[PDB]
Amino acid sequence: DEDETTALVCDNGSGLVKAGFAGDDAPRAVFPSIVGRPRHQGVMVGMGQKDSYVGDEAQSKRGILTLKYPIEHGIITNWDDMEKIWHHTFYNELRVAPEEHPTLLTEAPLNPKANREKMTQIMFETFNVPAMYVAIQAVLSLYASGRTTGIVLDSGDGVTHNVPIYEGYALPHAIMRLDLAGRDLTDY
Amino acid sequence: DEDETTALVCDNGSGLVKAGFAGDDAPRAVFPSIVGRPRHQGVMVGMGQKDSYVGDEAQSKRGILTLKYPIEHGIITNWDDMEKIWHHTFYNELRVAPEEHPTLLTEAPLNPKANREKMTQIMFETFNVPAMYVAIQAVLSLYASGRTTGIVLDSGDGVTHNVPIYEGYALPHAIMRLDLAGRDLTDYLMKILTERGYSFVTTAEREIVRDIKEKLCYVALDFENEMATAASSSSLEKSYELPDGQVITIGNERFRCPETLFQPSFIGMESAGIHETTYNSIMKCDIDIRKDLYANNVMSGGTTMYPGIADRMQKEITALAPSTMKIKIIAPPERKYSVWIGGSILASLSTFQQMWITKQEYDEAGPSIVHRKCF
Amino acid sequence: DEDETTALVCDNGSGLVKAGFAGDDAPRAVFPSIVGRPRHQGVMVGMGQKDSYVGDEAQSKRGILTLKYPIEHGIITNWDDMEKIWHHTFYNELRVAPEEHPTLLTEAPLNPKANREKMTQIMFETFNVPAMYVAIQAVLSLYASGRTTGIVLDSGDGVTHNVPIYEGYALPHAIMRLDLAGRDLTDYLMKILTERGYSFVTTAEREIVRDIKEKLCYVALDFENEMATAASSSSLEKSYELPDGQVITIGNERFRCPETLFQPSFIGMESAGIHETTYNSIMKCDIDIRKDLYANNVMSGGTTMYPGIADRMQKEITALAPSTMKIKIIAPPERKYSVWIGGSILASLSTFQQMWITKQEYDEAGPSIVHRKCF
Amino acid sequence: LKLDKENALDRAEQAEADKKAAEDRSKQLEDELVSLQKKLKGTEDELDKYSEALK
Amino acid sequence: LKLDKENALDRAEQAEADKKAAEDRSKQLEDELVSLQKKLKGTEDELDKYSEALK
Ligand SMILES: Nc1ncnc2c1ncn2[C@@H]1O[C@H](COP(=O)(O)OP(=O)(O)O)[C@@H](O)[C@H]1O
Ligand SMILES: Nc1ncnc2c1ncn2[C@@H]1O[C@H](COP(=O)(O)OP(=O)(O)O)[C@@H](O)[C@H]1O
C-alpha cells in the first residue's frame, strides 16, 4: 500500500515485534512475538479454528491457546514461527511485501550468531527480499536518541547487552552482557 | 416421502424422545421413551390389549401398564425397547425406513460409552442404516441456540450435564455433571401432592403428575417470599383436572417441587443447586474465557420451560458473579426441542459429511468404532 | 497421654492431615482434613445425628454428610474448620496438645502469606502453644530422605510444588509450581469411571473413588503399551467392590488417570507434565548444581505410591538428561509420610532450637512475626 | 361455536406467527441492544480512558 | 367442538397476549435499541472529541 520502495524495518524482540517502513518515526503496527496454539479438544463441527494463530490473532483468541514466543532471551530458535509472524506482519497488516522492499532487522552484538544468520536466510529465501541488513541495538539506540557517543543500556524483554560507543566506535572490551530482562521481572 | 437420503434424527432422552428428518427445524413426532406392559388382564371386548405398547401407545393405555423407560440417567440399558421405539418412530411416524437413510443419535459429553456403542450398533445391525453418528448434546444445544461460546445447561430428564464451551471447544476441567434432573422433579411432585391429599404412586399416576408439573409448576424468583405468600393465600393456587374428574390444586407445592433444582437435598442429593453448578462452570474456566461464558448462558432441554427459570438463573449467577461482567441467559422457544434441532443442523452441515460412520467401517471394526469416529 | 517434653508436628493439606510428636520417625495418626455436616433432616427419634463430624468421624459417616475441606491448593482459608480438625487431632486422638508443647506446621515455599500467618496465630491464640515454627515442605522432604541436596517432588492433595535445594540453600527461581495433585486425579477418575457406567458425583462418591484409585491405579513405566492392551482386553482390568454391592472394573482408565501427572492436558491443565517440571527444577539451577540434583531426585508426598512412578520418573529424566552422569530417584517407604517425618526432624534438631517463635515474641509482635522468625 | 375453534385457531396461529416475528425481532433487537450497549460501554470506557489521558 | 374451541381460544388469547407482548417487547427494545444507538453515537462522538482533544 506504500507508494515508494523504501526499506522495511522490523524490530523482533523476545516480547513484541515493532514494524513499519524505513524513514518513518514510528512502527506502523506492533505485533507480539507470538504464535498461539489451542490446548483444548474441539467439540463443535464447522467452527473454523486454526491450528495456530499469529501475532495479534494469538492474543485475540488466547482464552484457549497456549502462547509461545519463538525468540528466547533475544535469539530466534523457532524460525517457522518467525516466518509466520513476518508473513502476517508484512503482508496482512503493514501491507508491505518484502519482495519489493529491502529489510532491516535488529539484535544485541553478542546475540549468538545463529540469530543474525537465520534471520538473513529467511528473509532472502522465504520472502525473496531484494536486500538485507541486521543492525545492532546499541547503534540503533544512539541514532534514535540523537547521539554518537554514550552507553546503551537496553532494559528490554530478553537480554541486556550494555554497550558503550564513542564517536561512532564500538568499545567491545567494555561490554557487560547481563542475563536479566523484562521477562524475568514479570516472572518475579 | 423424501427426495434425498437425508439423515434421520432422534434425540432420545431418559424422558421423552423427539424425532424428525435432518433439514427440518422441528421433530415431526414426539414420543415418550417408553415401552409399556400390562399388569392386568383385560376383560371387556374391544379394549385393544397388547403384549407391549410403544411410545404414544404406552401412554394411551397407561392406566393398566407398567411404563418402562429403557434409558437410565442418560444411558440405554434396554436395547430391545429402543428397537421398538426406533422402528415405530422412523417407520410409522416419520414414514422412513432407516435402511435407505443415515441416522444421527445424541448423548451427553460424559454419558457412559456403552450408550454410544448401542445406539450405533442397533441402527447398523437391526435397522441396517447406511451410516451413523452419535452427536454431542452440548454441540447441538449451541447450534440450535445460535452460539459457539457459552454455558450449556441441557437440564434433561435423567441428568443436568453442565458444560462450558469456548470458540467451539470443550472446557472439560470445568464440567460439573449433576445427578438432579426432570425425572426427580416428577417423582418429588408425586410426593408433595401426596402431602396435600392427592396420592400418586403408580406409573399411570407418574404420567399424570408429569403433565401437572409441565402446566402448573414454576421455580419462583424469590422462593421464601413466594412460599410465605402461597402458604398464606389461595391467590397462588392453581387447579388441574385429573382423568377421573377429580380436581387437584397446588399451593406452595407449585414451586417447592421445582425448587429442588436449586435445592437438590429435597430429593436426597448432595449438591449446591443448579445455579451454583452453572456458576461452577463459568468461574473455573480461564480468566479470558469467563466474560464470554457469563454473557452466553445457554438453555436447552426441558425444565428450562418453568416460567421463572431463565430469570432466576440469570439473577443467581449475577449474584455469584463479579461486577462489570454481563450475565445473560438465552432461553429460546426451541426449548426442550433444541437438542433435536441442533441434530438436524449437524447432520446436514457440509463440514460434517465426513464425520459419518459408514456401514462398511462399522462392520470391519465392530460396535466400538463409535469411540474413534464420533468424539 | 504422652510425657515427652517435645515439639508437635502436623502436615495439613486439602485431603489428609498427618500428625504426631517430634523426635519420632512416623506420625501417630493420620486424619482427613474434614469437617462433616449432615445433609439430611432427621425424622426418627433416637437416630443420633451430630451437628458436625470431625476428621475420621466425617469420613466414616460420609454416606449421609457433606464433607468440607478447609485447604485450597495448599492454603487454609477455613481456619475455623482447621481449628476443629486440630482439636480432634491433638486433644482427642494423638493424645497430646500444643498448650504444653512447641508446635511445627508445614507449607509449600510459594504458599500465599496468609497461610503461615494463620497457622502461627491459631496455635498461639486458640491452642495457647508456648512456641511456633512454620516449615517449608521442601526442607522437610529432604531431611526425611537423608538429603541436603535434591529435587523435592512434593505431590500433595491440592498442589505439587517441584522445588530444588542445594547444600541446604533454596534455588527458588527453579521452582515449578503445578496445579495438579491427588485431589485432581480423584476428580478425573470420577469422570472416566462415569464413562464406564459408574457415575460418581457426590463427595461420598469422591471418597469411594479416592479409595479405588489408591488401591487399583498406577502410572505405568510404558503408558502406551499398557494402554493399548488395557483398552483392548479384560486381562488388564482390576475389580473393586463398591459399598452398595456393585463391582466396578477398571481397564486403561486404571492408568489414564495417574498418567495425568505426565500429561496434565487430560484434565485441561496447561502444563508440560511432572517429568518436565522435575527436569526444569534441575536445569534452571547452575551447572555445578545440576549434576547433584540429577543424582538426587527426591519423592515426597503421596501419588509417589503409584506403580511405575519411581521407575518412570527416573526413565523420563534420564531420557532428557545427558549421558555418563547418574540420574537417581529416592523413593523410600516413608513415601507420603516423609514430610511429617521431616517436620519431626526439623523440630527436634538442636540446630533448630533457636528458630522457634516463643509466646513472648509472638504476643508482642502479632502474626506478622512469622515473616521475621520462620521464613 | 361451529367456526369458533377455527376463528380462535386462526387467531392463535396468526397471533403466533406475529408473535414469532415479533419475538424474533425482540431477540434480534435485544442482541443488538446488548451488543450496542456493550459498544456504548466500550466507547464510554474509552471516553474515560481518553478523558483521563486528556486530563 | 367446545374442547377444540377452548383449546384454540386459550391459544388465541394467549397467543394474542403473547404477540402483543412480543410486539411490545420488540417495540420497547427497538426504542431502547435506538436509545442505545443514540447514546452510542453520543459516546462515539464524545470519544472522538476526547480522542481528538487528547491527540
Ligand atoms: N413447562 C415445564 N415445566 C417443568 N418441566 C418441564 C417443562 N417442559 C419440559 N420439562 C421437562 O423436561 C424433560 C424433557 O426432556 P428432553 O429435554 O425433551 O430430553 P431431550 O433433550 O433428549 O429431548 C421432562 O422431564 C419434562 O417433564
Ligand atoms: N496408594 C496410592 N496410590 C495413588 N495415590 C496415592 C496413594 N497414596 C497416597 N496417594 C495420594 O496422596 C494423597 C496423600 O498424600 P500426602 O502427601 O501425605 O498429602 P499431604 O502432604 O497433604 O498430607 C492422597 O490424597 C492420594 O490422592
Residue numbers in the entry:
A (entry chain C): 1 to 188
B (entry chain A), C (entry chain B): 1 to 375
D (entry chain Q), E (entry chain P): 11 to 65
How did the manuscript describe this experimental structure?
Tm is a long α-helical coiled-coil protein that binds over seven actin subunits on one of the two long-pitch helical strand of actin filament and forms head-to-tail connections with adjacent Tm molecules to produce a continuous helical strand along actin filament. Upon Ca2+ release from the SR, however, Ca2+ binding to TnC causes conformational changes of Tn and a shift in the azimuthal position of Tm on actin filament to allow actin–myosin interactions. Here we have determined the structure of the entire thin filament from human cardiac muscle in the absence and presence of Ca2+ by fully utilizing the recent technical advances in cryoEM and image analysis.
The resolution of the 3D reconstruction is 6.6 Å at a Fourier Shell Correlation of 0.143. The density of the core domain of Tn together with a long two-stranded coiled coil of Tm is visualized clearly on each strand of actin filament, with one of them at a higher position than the other by the axial rise of actin subunit along actin filament. The Tn core model thus built binds to each strand of actin filament over two actin subunits. The C-terminal region of TnI comprising the inhibitory region (residues 137–148), regulatory switch (residues 149–160) and mobile region (residues 163–210) is present as a mostly continuous density (red) extending up along and between actin strand and Tm coiled coil from the C-terminal end (Gly 137) of the TnI helix within the Tn core. The other one (dark blue) is also highly elongated and is extending back from Gly 199 of TnT across the actin filament strands and down towards Tm on the other actin strand to form a long N-terminal α-helix making a specific interaction with the C-terminal end of Tm near the head-to-tail junction. TnTN residues 87–150 fitted to the map extends further down beyond the head-to-tail junction and reaches nearly the bottom of the third actin subunits below the Tn core from which the TnTN density extends.
